[PDB]
Design an enzyme around this catalytic site. Structure first.
Site, PDB file in Angstrom:
ATOM      1  CD  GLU A   1      47.010  33.938  45.823  1.00  0.00           C
ATOM      2  OE1 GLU A   1      46.717  33.664  44.819  1.00  0.00           O
ATOM      3  OE2 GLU A   1      46.071  35.629  46.008  1.00  0.00           O
TER       4      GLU A   1
ATOM      5  N   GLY B   1      48.731  33.800  41.690  1.00  0.00           N
ATOM      6  CA  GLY B   1      48.840  32.821  42.681  1.00  0.00           C
ATOM      7  C   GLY B   1      49.891  32.242  42.331  1.00  0.00           C
TER       8      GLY B   1
ATOM      9  CB  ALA C   1      43.753  31.734  38.847  1.00  0.00           C
TER      10      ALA C   1
ATOM     11  CD  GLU D   1      46.377  38.353  42.311  1.00  0.00           C
ATOM     12  OE1 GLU D   1      47.127  39.243  42.290  1.00  0.00           O
ATOM     13  OE2 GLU D   1      46.414  37.055  41.964  1.00  0.00           O
TER      14      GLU D   1
END
Ligand code: CO8
Ligand code: CO8
Ligand code: CO8
Ligand code: CO8
Ligand code: CO8
Ligand code: CO8
Ligand code: MG
Ligand code: MG
Lengths: 260, 260, 260, 260, 260, 260
Positions: free
Chosen positions: E114, E111, E68, E134
């Site tokens: 993911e 992300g 992200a 993260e």
């Protein structure tokens, strides 16, 4: 057939309901291995018959089933519980595809309450009583007395019954959600047969799918239970009864299901 | 925007309650594609409205919702249901984050019972009736009718309704657990709005967290459900409404929540 | 021992029941950390005593417990939760192997309702009241107010109480399944002690296995829960109380359990 | 006995290992109803045999099992699957309480891979090949080909095999975790029998409890699975083999288990 | 269509595979709001196309997706995250019915990992790298980075990657279970498309059922997974492609599926 | 301290990693009650120490832990395990909220393998060996030896190890998923401390949430686990380290976390 502990017969009009009665009024319908065997045989015969659509398991007017025969399991060893013949054929009721109604009259304690809880619908008499007295003899329930009971009446009442062995009346069972209807002792069996008749008048393949989806509410999470229900719902459209049932409604007529 | 099957308006003091009334008195509130599409739009605009804190879903005085339009799914085949855009937009209520109250007046059959069961609170009228007659038309419930019902009223009663299609009165629903309160037919909608008003008087962010916490009871084990509730409880300390509400208790005054 | 918030003592004949009374008739038995500590200590002492077979948790006639002390958690930060000495010793009641009965008189709100729900059996007074007003102070229940409540009274009533904070009567609590018995205010404590005595008279080892099996209903699927019940039922045959309890029945005499 | 599709015999020293072979070289061991019925008979005979401690399922050098007989299920309709003798007795191998080792040589496709995954231990040959070609004929696995495979080789590889129908080598299965050992094509059966002999050298009761504890990992959460393992650990203390096994260890000698 | 952050095109012979390429080589394919929206739109278009059978999600040769955009979520707050939608629209891959293959080249961090894990199949380049950094910026995964990862690579490696943020090689991801096939950098996209073509040649309705069966392996227990798989297996007999596929095999010819 | 079975100290630069070593070279690090009592004390002080960010559990160069002391549980009764003090306090390692790394050198058998599996990360030496020989003494694992093992290495290998008591090399554990890294016997502890230091350099409050999110994978469904991850992801925004971490990234500098 010749049964020593039960009476198997097809009751009701059209011979669509199978009545399984336990004949042992001298021991309050004690659930021995011999009785359990005959019960399983009768269930299999009714489940493997195209005419039978629903089964009604009933006992006597004074006691439905007083549980397992303590005289048999008295001298059983711990090793004799894992690698033996004893106490293995009790869960046959949970593997039946057709609806099974439980007509409970009088005492339904221990195995009896477990036998009724294993059935879809439970009709109790005005004088019926339920209890789990296993704790009073130094043991705990072993066929759902602590799993199906807790899910039905909750933890508060289940803990009391299982830990105290006290009895609950048919009214409390109705109010707690264990039984669905209370009928007079004289007409309990007839009411159960009348209910089974209505259930057998529907598409058997759809009735089985419905029972499966309802039972799936205790084995899955709501999110997955809904998806499984929708898939079974989709599958209903592959049957001919679905087309017949919906077509009858739009045409304002009675449906003629063919069980396919 | 214009609506053909529903009436959407904001009610209650300060217009904090959104009212969605199914308007189809000629088909007993048949849940067709058009009605569901407008229902989802009404739910969306109220969801994105910062003034509305709760929603009230109601129907008519004689029928709340008669279920899906059987005349539309009659010709549907198996292939259509699985990969065609007919029966796919029924679960929008489950995604609504704001509380929803179901004011059930009259018939709540099939999809209607499911529609009401998907809401958080169900207020039923004195003459309201709930049923799952899907089995009578050759199908089973397809929107959680066999999952939420079984978890609320129990297996015994749920099995009967799903397999027999018989109706249960509002009193039976309140005693089982399907509905919480029974109100007069003429005051049902107003009492539901009054309940929505009390809900909307609290911080929305905390109201949403609480709603999610309750829903977790049907998706997780009691151990994990408690741990999730604990984390959500800790999350409340990161909002200003929590400090305001608790400060409004030590200081004997009324809390002025700011939805943050 | 010397306690400032509770009164721990062994009541009943033969001193087989332990009574924990919250003595704070000025804040309606606010659950302060010091009170929770004393409560946990009393529970440990009773659980580590071979004489106490069951515990009875009670409060005042006008209030059982008014929840956590908002005076303390007012200034707590988000970091003080996930990482401090705050609100961490509440769930000790869930690890108690012996049965616990909740004698609820008067107000049982917030932490008090959760404290009562953590017990196995709840006896409510005629004037007792239950509620989850956390939503009124900008917080949500964080100790099982949503998990154990929803599984007992249902989603509709649980959602209402959590999203509105309204009070339910003792009668409604029983009809929903939260409490088992409604006892008079003047005899609530005595009835609970009598029930605890009836539980403490059975085999402690079997009573423990029974409680754990009932708790499993909220942590496992019905299939696995039934198999866990089977293994627990089989394990009872390894104890001496199992044979004594069954032999006494066959011989039609009273069983003298040895708790082994 | 007279088996037309299998060869059942007790191999290994002391005849403690029961070998079940599928003799159908002209169809790559296609799993027909007759073959499955004989397979279930051999499993029951070895399960009831008190001398057999472990079973070894094997096929041919070129094909373990090529799946179900497509020629039989070709004309089956949707209604035929939900009734009419079709495809019910496939999961009998999962109910065998004794350990079962799968010796896979050559093709293990569809039902063959499912049968292997149903066993406890899987020994694959250097040339063994596993695949799920159901998708290539317009169907999907129906005996766990999408549940056990995914749990073993992961979603990434499981999706490729199930959606593409491609094969994986014995080396790929071992690295993915589907098989535990790769043995030569000429000595795969012997090594499988040797492993069975080692398993059949310990307490059968403890072996059964161990197997049930391992299968428990795929049916519950980690929290509940640990408690069941702990309870099963407490249960085995009631057996005599537990005392004999540990006593021999403390005395530095060989334990002579009695299976009780 | 006009896309600024992605390139959507239909690749492969017969135009049966849809390719979605993230075109942002100035930020390592940072998943911003605009990029996610375009990605979702492309997915919806391919999902609602009768020609596309599988989708291939890819990025650049040096970076698949760097996660992200931290530049956007820097000034976000707890209130703007829980109530105001700023981070959603990421789980749009979990609702796609058609198989999706992730061609991962270079960096797949946060992300990006993911995003790849949300797909059904993952093809990684020889120089690809996966990580969950993260923790290095004071945050945890938010799109199932811990759930889907732990269920594939294991707790030990999942814990290390999440608590340390270290990168794993494509080989490590292959041996752990996160990647199914390692392809050269210059041929990763082509091989992924070839695999998608092999998936886009079977019955779409059956391919969807197969995918749903595999996905269900992480949402319920094994016993229930087997039941749902068996029911979905029965449902396949209601489609025409099932008969065509099996008849072609018996006739030893190629099957001509029609997605019905 | 005055420990008698362990050597607890804080290693690494800045004293941010706590090393717990088991000192018992005459019994292969047998896990007796005295060792477990001290192990729990060492874990407690390190957990309460605000400077320690991670813990490293290690043994000797020849053996990590050879399971519980058989000489202490030889004469135990079924009632003692269920009621007495014996065999308790083994699960305290799982309640530690801080990360724990298991440096395994040499034998890790029985309780030692379970103790290592209870940690978050496991670093094994080139000569390390894992096994579950409980079956060879007439018992089964009792501290998650079957639950955590099966969930990591798979059913095929788990079944073999549990039923045969066979040892697996450190390479097998790495390829299966039990251990994440293999290090030289001489530098195993150093590399483990370095890894623990890396984990201790990040926000401890976020590290705790991360560990909680990873452990969540083995306790819930994938759908619910993803939602909890989001709520924990949202809760991270309430911390100051989240703002500091992301602020440092956009500014291309090193984040100075404050553990809040
Ligand atoms: C895992 C698979 C198996 C697991 C299943 C769970 C295990 C169990 O079910 S344990 C059995 C539970 N125990 C019970 O249910 C209660 C036992 N029965 C009683 O307490 C009483 O008989 C009760 C209350 C039902 C009615 O009592 P009451 O009206 O006073 O008449 P009572 O004299 O006791 O009964 C008449 C006859 O029934 C016999 N009987 C009653 N119950 C049983 C029984 N469970 N087993 C054997 N005989 C019984 C009596 O012994 C007596 O026979 P007899 O005089 O020839 O010896
Ligand atoms: C998730 C994706 C979809 C899954 C959703 C689950 C599937 C479903 O919901 S199946 C539908 C539910 N099934 C039923 O309701 C069985 C229907 N029984 C009835 O409908 C009765 O009308 C009942 C008992 C509610 C009221 O009876 P009554 O007072 O005699 O009124 P009735 O004679 O039927 O006529 C009233 C009007 O309502 C219409 N109507 C009533 N229900 C429906 C319906 N479900 N669909 C279409 N029209 C309906 C009637 O056809 C009639 O219209 P018209 O005169 O033009 O033909
Ligand atoms: C680990 C996770 C644990 C936390 C899980 C969930 C968190 C909680 O439990 S939050 C606390 C529960 N919330 C509530 O109870 C809402 C409070 N409403 C009340 O407390 C009311 O007092 C009620 C309705 C019970 C009775 O009210 P009423 O009869 O009018 O008398 P009231 O004057 O309010 O009470 C008398 C004394 O009790 C005090 N008191 C009552 N409840 C509390 C309380 N929860 N905390 C502190 N003091 C309290 C009052 O402040 C007052 O003290 P004082 O005169 O010195 O200021
Ligand atoms: C509870 C519900 C029931 C349980 C659900 C499980 C049911 C299933 O979904 S499993 C069915 C799926 N299995 C398969 O698709 C594999 C089919 N087999 C094949 O594709 C090929 O034979 C394969 C790849 C093994 C390679 O074999 P190959 O070397 O090419 O030689 P091939 O000629 O095909 O085989 C030799 C003989 O084996 C026959 N055979 C092979 N597999 C099968 C089979 N599954 N069924 C019937 N016959 C088969 C062949 O037809 C041929 O016989 P013949 O010449 O007399 O007609
Ligand atoms: C409900 C939940 C929904 C949302 C949940 C999703 C949660 C998340 O994804 S959090 C984001 C986690 N991702 C990361 O931490 C990785 C961040 N990126 C990096 O660490 C490095 O850039 C890395 C290792 C990928 C490559 O580094 P390197 O090769 O040295 O080149 P680098 O200079 O850093 O990158 C080049 C450009 O990419 C930018 N960039 C890289 N990653 C990002 C990013 N995640 N966001 C924004 N910009 C980024 C850089 O800032 C730089 O841009 P510029 O020069 O204009 O400032
Ligand atoms: C529910 C809560 C508790 C549940 C926890 C689960 C229960 C368990 O863990 S059961 C115990 C399982 N562990 C085992 O079975 C392995 C026992 N250990 C062994 O067998 C050895 O490691 C072995 C043969 C593999 C390698 O050892 P080896 O180098 O050949 O020499 P060995 O003689 O065995 O060891 C040297 C010393 O270690 C002692 N020792 C080794 N293991 C143990 C043990 N588990 N307990 C006590 N002493 C042990 C030996 O007895 C010996 O001491 P001594 O000479 O004074 O008698
Ligand atoms: Mg109820
Ligand atoms: Mg693996």
């Amino acid at each position: 057939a010749n049964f020593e502990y039960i009476i198997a017969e097809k009751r009701g009009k059209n011979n669509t309901v199978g009545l399984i009665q336990l004949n042992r009024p001298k021991a309050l319908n004690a659930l021995c291995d011999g009785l359990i065997d005959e019960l399983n045989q009768a269930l299999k015969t009714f489940e493997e018959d195209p005419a039978v659509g629903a089964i009604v398991l009933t006992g006597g007017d004074k006691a439905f089933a007083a549980g397992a025969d303590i005289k048999e399991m008295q001298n059983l060893s711990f090793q004799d519980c894992y690698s033996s013949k004893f106490l293995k054929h009790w869960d046959h009721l949970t593997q039946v595809k057709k609806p099974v109604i439980a007509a409970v009259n009088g005492y339904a304690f221990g195995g009896g309450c477990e036998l009724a809880m294993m059935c879809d619908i439970i009709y109790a008499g005005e004088k019926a009583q339920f209890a789990q007295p296993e704790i009073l003899i130094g043991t705990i329930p072993g066929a759902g007395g602590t799993q199906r009971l807790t899910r039905a009446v909750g933890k508060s009442l289940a803990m009391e019954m299982v830990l105290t062995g006290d009895r609950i009346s048919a009214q409390d069972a109705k109010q707690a959600g264990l039984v669905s209807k209370i009928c007079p002792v004289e007409t309990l069996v007839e009411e159960a047969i009348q209910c089974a008749e209505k259930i057998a008048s529907n598409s058997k393949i759809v009735v089985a799918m419905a029972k499966e989806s309802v039972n799936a509410a205790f084995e899955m999470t709501l999110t997955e239970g809904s998806k499984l229900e929708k898939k079974l719902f989709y599958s209903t459209f592959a049957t001919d009864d679905r087309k017949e049932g919906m077509t009858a409604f739009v045409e304002k007529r009675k449906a003629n299901f063919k069980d396919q």
